Every structure is written in structure tokens, then in C-alpha cells.
Amino acid sequence: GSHSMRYFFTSVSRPGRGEPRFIAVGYVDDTQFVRFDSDAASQRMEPRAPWIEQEGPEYWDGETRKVKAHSQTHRVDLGTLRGYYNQSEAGSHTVQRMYGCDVGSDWRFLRGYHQYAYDGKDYIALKEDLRSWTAADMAAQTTKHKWEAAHVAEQLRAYLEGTCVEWLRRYLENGKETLQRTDAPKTHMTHHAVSDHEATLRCWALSFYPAEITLTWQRDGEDQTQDTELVETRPAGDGTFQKWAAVVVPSGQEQRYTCHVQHEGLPKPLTLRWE
């Protein structure tokens, strides 16, 4: 199927003393593979997947240099934005950045992106054409003008269509044993009586990868969302994901209800019923 490489960055200013907290994470699909935390002792980019550990010292030196450069850019940005928005030096503020590239099933470039936020709201983002910028307000319009004059989108486009995709493919091969493996959800149903006349049926999907999944309840063959609850997909902590969906039903009528599970690891969707 399709694949992605994405990097996430957060910087949080610390007005009482010192530099912003800076945290960077890199993902291939739903697998974290590198991290940098300004509060950690190494002050290096660190591996978080076995298949990246085989990269040599030139790689780790270069990723450390670049991630520290990202952190200083964010530090400067927090100052710039405090001034743009005429804000006091005494408050804590946040910048967030995410960029990356997608490839299709043929591993050819599909799309690229680069998004930036201040205090949890859109600030500036690269358009899908990888040529121009979407500015959310007039401060970001100032940034857009600066970045247009400095050829920023050109450099970023070249990375997103070239380097980003080329290294994604490298990682996909080096980590093929996990990155190119789908883990179909392990599914089961539980039953929880609510009264003499009602029960909750809960449809479980466990230990699946990637995280994308659809759980749907049907009654007598038609979708039902009334009296259902669907929790956010959540990490198991071992690299896989979990989700459940529940419905309240009249006791004795459980056979009308079916849970339907769609996932990339399933050739055909699964149907579960309470017996």
C-alpha cells in the first residue's frame, strides 16, 4: 500500500528561565523511528526503531546537526511571533511544525506537505502544489512575503519530491520485516448487561497496524449509530493499536447486531456477532 515519512516538532517557551522545551519525532507510517528531546541527556537524535540503528555515524551526526538547527529556528520564531502579535515576554507560547511526504503503492511520490502553527492555530502552510504558501492572518502574510523572496518553497519542494521520498524508500526496505507488514486486528465481542432488559455489546479490535481502521455496527443489515459509542484509536504501547465500538441493545435481540471491521490487513472485512 501507500506509505509516508513525517516529522513533528514542538517548541514551548519558558519565560521564567532558559530556552524553550523542544521535542522532535520522526515517523514512517505509524512507526516512530527517531526522536530528539531538548531535556534528554544525549543532546543527539536517537533511534527508536531497530531498522534505523544500522545507519552509520555520519547519519547520526547529520540528523543531530539538523534537528538542533530546527530547534534554534523555533527559538527565534517564538521571539519573532511574540513581537508580531505584540505579546508580553512573561507568557509561555508554542510553535508546532509538521512536514513529510507520501508515496503510493509503487513507491513513487504522491504528495508533500509542510504545516506550521502558533499557539495551536494555523499560521502558515505549504500548498499542495509545493509552490506557494497559505497564510492564515496578516502576521503570516509577512512571513509569506519573506519566504517568497527567499526561494523557500523551491528548496522545500526539492526535498519533499526527492530526498524525502528517496530516504522513505530506503527505510521501507531496511525495515521491511515490520514496515511492510500489516497486522490485521484481532477481534472479539464482549457483552455487559445493563439491566434486566438491556445489554451493551462491545466490539474489540486489538493489536493492529497501521492505525487506520473502521468499526461499524449494523442492525438487521443497516448501519446504526444511535446508542453507539466509538472510542478514539489508541496505542497499545508495543507499536500496535486498539479500538472498540459499543452498542446498547434490548436483551435477547443480540443476534440482530453485527460489528463490521475494515482494515488494510484484512482481505475482506470481518463480521462479528454475539452468540
Binding site: 539538523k66 530546527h70 512536514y99
Partner: peptide
């Protein structure tokens, strides 16, 4: 691999 130097805003 990271992008080399995103510029300050």
C-alpha cells in the same frame, strides 16, 4: 532524514 534548515519565519 530531516530537511536541511527550514528558515526562520
Amino acid at each position: 532524514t530531516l530537511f536541511d534548515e527550514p528558515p526562520p519565519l
